[PDB]
Structure 1
């Protein structure tokens, strides 16, 4: 097994001493191949990059979800919510059973109207820009996605479009996540210098918790019925245990869904638009579909399902830059990987998703090209070749929510504006555990098509 350069007792750790550790690991994967060992003091991981090995790692009877060191840090504020719990923790199975029906087709049709509310707000912001102005893409996508999960899921309005800067919830989340990514790299964690980092970390957790208080308090005082994600959190009962979720876990689920429910979708929309402006025939082809399908003043649910080519664009953006670029597994038992790499019970594997998605033996030599057509026939794609939403029972529960939201929004965008890459933007990918293209700006010239009023 290959292993990258080492530095005495620090082993491989200094290689992650960089603002872009995922991109560093991709370069390492390129040089070393499908598997490499990565050591830090008191830690060893095996990074996987080939569909061949990742298909075995995908076997749930052999491997289960691991909370990598970073998810452990996130756990300080996300606790035993769905994302940061072990598969066998009481509250994983309990919350998964309780909340799974909140992401059914029937539930998706119910979120649609509120997804439209927020999308209308985005479109109105861009219609209302003066000729001198431009769009900050990731910043506006984060306004959109945070607002959509807040409203659809919790009947709460962050009102992100009524703010020139990020919402204070975003500012604290990003700082919290950034701090988690920083702790990894500290060879000397408890040194009194990092006490300022710790104080600020608690302050950020306080900010996120105070917001959760408001979401709970606003529901308590509602008067109206919502029948949404939060209803099911508050009232749903586990079939297999007879119990509802207790108050402590509910607070962790809310934090969990606010963060997991927006951040990566914001990244996806940003990348999608990035790829659209850099590939003019794809853009025109996507715009033509949006115009052809979106005939009413606001989009209906069924129409979003018909935005087939938009779905393909979104999938091809997840292919090149999956916005949650990594997930961790551990061996349940002593086992051998690919008939060649022996693992002991509890050994860690990191699935490096952007590299999985660049496996030339699966996609072809043209992996770097943006080509939505790869997704024309989705069942043509081998199992485990394409995993932007993770794996098995620990796969993304919000997958259809994200894609429906991103398809709706990108459809409306393409219907209502022409986009211009006026700075000739140079791709610069920022890492905060998740990925987004930093400083991506465009200009949107309105096609001046009237926008319908918000349903409900």
Structure 2
């Protein structure tokens, strides 16, 4: 019944099976499936995640319209995650008026002025990461980068969302480290075929996030609120002060902190691991970046908000890695009203999809794409890229609100790790075969050789 929609609108696409749509095509992963359909079915195609109609667009003008131009009016919210409970008030999960209220109440928290005042504090746990990196350099055996980066990513997240200056890997007993370190898949794939099961799961009070960690963060936020009763450089602080549009709730503040927590842990650790692999398989970029790191700031010169943005090559290295590996893999907006965007009728309720992975590896906009060529973002070539094709943090008023923070957190960590060690390929795997699941992480871990100086 729903499969004739994209046939009525005259939109090509793989013929879907009843009750399932095109979920069987997800056997090669979201990324492989999106690239294949872009070559065959053209610039715009449509498929079905069960009964949910999905429209893929690649035209940059349509993309701008969906993300920027007609954002508040037609394309505002994302597709329902699933059995989310009290986390429905999360800024990434809120819809329509609650999202506009939450983002305005949280936008000044990620201001360039607020990030500069937290730069010296974000380096205390970073020096602890180098201390834990020298002991691994004493061993000639390779080291998995996801655990070391996650240890740093948890320390910075805890020390920036709250005041817990910790050594996550070296102190594996604090409740803050324990809850975060504990936390496609058979569950998420079933929700796509059965969106009718989403409201039934919430009636069963079974949410996709372990409830044991939610109550632990609820009591932690309660005791931290009692600890406030001169912390002026803290995510929560900035949320409690603005609390005392409408007002921000207490449990609402608990939900957003969990967003800030996870968005800076596996997300940051994943990108940090993708960067170092490409630096290990391309040591000329590693050497030049190490040479450029010592140029703007000599050996044993601490980074600063003004100095990080000066190293031009470090920004080129993070951009190309995000291109080759956009951990989002997709951007989604729900067409909540009948709209004709760029000569195309989009009915209501249709999920409009933007394949970041496919456009990041499209030969039309990138020459030799599968090749890590960080020179694509040089001062003379960074103007040729279309900002609506390379969207690692998305775009529009619902882009990544922590883009500046995540870029600073990773760049501040990269400057200190590269000015003390070098990374050589150990036994790793050049093919770097991506995982076939719903995350843009490698199932095979990232283990390379770390050499000192």
Equivalent pair of 2:58/2:354 in contact (CA under 8 Å): yes
The alpha-carbon distance between structure 1 residues 72 and 404, as it changes in their structure 2 partners (threshold 3 A), is same
Task: Structure 1: state its 5+ residue gaps.
Answer: 448-456
Equivalent pair of 1:275/1:317 in contact (CA under 8 Å): yes
For 1:56-455, list aligned pairs within 5 A: 56-61=65-70, 63-69=74-80, 71-73=81-83, 75-76=84-85, 78-89=87-98, 92-129=99-136, 130-157=138-165, 159-162=167-170, 167-173=177-183, 178=185, 181-185=188-192, 204-221=210-227, 224-237=230-243, 241=245, 243-295=246-298, 296-339=300-343, 341-363=344-366, 365-377=367-379, 378-425=382-429, 426-430=431-435, 433-438=438-443, 439-447=445-453
Equivalent pair of 1:138/1:436 in contact (CA under 8 Å): no
The alpha-carbon distance between structure 1 residues 446 and 366, as it changes in their structure 2 partners (threshold 3 A), is same
Structure 1 position 22, deviation (Å)? 4.0
Q: Which has the higher helix share?
A: 1
SS of structure 2 residue aligned to 1:361? coil
The alpha-carbon distance between structure 1 residues 82 and 336, as it changes in their structure 2 partners (threshold 3 A), is same
SS of structure 2 residue aligned to 1:156? coil
Alignment partners' CA distance in 1, 2:274 and 2:126: 18
Task: Structure 2: state its 5+ residue gaps.
Answer: 1-10
Q: Residues 77-135 of structure 1: CA distance to partner in whole angstroms, max 9, x if unpaired?
A: 5221211111322xx22322222111112211122122212221221111012324322
Deviates more, 1:309-318 or 1:103-112: 103-112
Q: Residues 269-316 of structure 1: CA distance to partner in whole angstroms, max 9, x if unpaired?
A: 111111111222212111111122232443222222222201110011
Partner of 1:450: none
Q: What root-mean-square deviation, in Å, do the aligned CA atoms of Structure 1 and Structure 2 show?
A: 3.1
Alignment partners' CA distance in 2, 1:65 and 1:186: 23
Correspondence 1:46 to 2:50: no
Equivalent pair of 2:428/2:446 in contact (CA under 8 Å): no
The alpha-carbon distance between structure 1 residues 330 and 188, as it changes in their structure 2 partners (threshold 3 A), is closer
Structure 1 position 158, deviation (Å)? 5.5
Alignment partners' CA distance in 1, 2:384 and 2:209: 49
Alignment partners' CA distance in 1, 2:209 and 2:334: 33
The alpha-carbon distance between structure 1 residues 398 and 10, as it changes in their structure 2 partners (threshold 3 A), is same
The alpha-carbon distance between structure 1 residues 202 and 312, as it changes in their structure 2 partners (threshold 3 A), is closer
The alpha-carbon distance between structure 1 residues 208 and 308, as it changes in their structure 2 partners (threshold 3 A), is farther
Correspondence 1:35 to 2:37: no
Equivalent pair of 1:265/1:406 in contact (CA under 8 Å): yes
Equivalent pair of 1:55/1:383 in contact (CA under 8 Å): no
Equivalent pair of 1:155/1:226 in contact (CA under 8 Å): no
SS of structure 2 residue aligned to 1:206? helix
Q: Residues 371-426 of structure 1: CA distance to partner in whole angstroms, max 9, x if unpaired?
A: 21211234443331221111211111100101111111111111111111112424
Equivalent pair of 2:140/2:449 in contact (CA under 8 Å): no
Alignment partners' CA distance in 1, 2:148 and 2:436: 18
SS of structure 2 residue aligned to 1:349? strand
Structure 1 position 43, deviation (Å)? 1.0
Structure 1 position 143, deviation (Å)? 1.9
Alignment partners' CA distance in 2, 1:348 and 1:103: 29
* Count of aligned positions: 430
Equivalent pair of 1:11/1:40 in contact (CA under 8 Å): yes
Q: Residues 1-43 of structure 1: CA distance to partner in whole angstroms, max 9, x if unpaired?
A: 2222533432212223x48334433344344333221113331
Correspondence 1:13 to 2:16: no
Partner of 2:14: 4
The alpha-carbon distance between structure 1 residues 414 and 81, as it changes in their structure 2 partners (threshold 3 A), is same
Partner of 1:453: none
Task: Give the TM-score, by structure 2 length.
Answer: 0.85
Alignment partners' CA distance in 2, 1:125 and 1:19: 38
Task: Give the TM-score, by structure 1 length.
Answer: 0.84
Q: Residues 51-82 of structure 1: CA distance to partner in whole angstroms, max 9, x if unpaired?
A: 3542343343264233213x344x33522121
